[PDB]
DNA sequence: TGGAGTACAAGTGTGAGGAAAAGTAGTTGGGACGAAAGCAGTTGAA
């Protein structure tokens, strides 16, 4: 349930988000010159945006100059079907050199479809399986306001390599 | 009182997946104790 202190990384992971953000590239120059008549890859697509780095999400004031008129013209099934098809056919020869479920993630994240599976249950590495297991307890007492049995999992956790800063200074 | 079609399992090739700790990929940090004198041949113009 809760979130772990790990640097966790797979080759599955690795892939289905560079399948994604290689994919994310072609359909956001296509956008353009639908509204033009109107390489790392994921690198490339951060320099887009500006992390926030104080905040978790870029808020903004809003009573200010930031506003915008509301843009008329709206999206419908047949210009969504004809922007999205030729990024959708560049993208269909490396779905094939990629994994079958890395492919089976991009097929279905693409219709709607987030994924159900949470990347740090089948890691099964028996020692992130501990430190899956001791910070769902760390925070259980914390929830139950048990204070010396939650000591007892914080000294354990941070003897255990591999753990980060999250659970270190938070709960102090 | 033999044959026509046919799902359940015994049984056989193709690649595709899984993992880690080593190495290498771009930014930023950082490296470079001296304001002395009367005097003389040349040399100023008268």
Redesign the pocket.
């Known amino acids: 349930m809760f979130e772990v202190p790990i640097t966790l990384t797979?080759?599955?992971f690795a892939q289905r988000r560079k399948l994604k953000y290689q994919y994310i590239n072609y359909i956001s120059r296509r956008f353009d010159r639908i509204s033009k008549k109107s390489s790392d890859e994921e690198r490339k697509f951060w320099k887009k945006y500006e992390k926030p780095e104080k905040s978790f999400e870029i808020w903004r004031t809003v009573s200010s100059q930031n506003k915008q008129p509301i843009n008329k013209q709206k999206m419908t099934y047949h210009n969504f079907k004809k922007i999205e098809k030729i990024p959708l056919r560049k993208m269909e020869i490396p779905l094939l050199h990629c994994?079958?479920?890395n492919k089976l993630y991009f097929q279905s994240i693409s219709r709607g479809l987030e994924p159900l599976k949470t990347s740090t249950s089948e890691?099964?590495?028996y020692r992130t399986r501990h430190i899956v297991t001791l910070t769902d307890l760390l925070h259980l007492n914390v929830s139950r306001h048990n204070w010396s049995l939650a000591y007892k999992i914080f000294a354990t956790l941070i003897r255990i390599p591999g753990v980060q800063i999250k659970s270190l200074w938070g709960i102090g």
Do not use: A, I, S
């Open positions: 797979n080759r599955k994994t079958k479920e890691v099964r590495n």
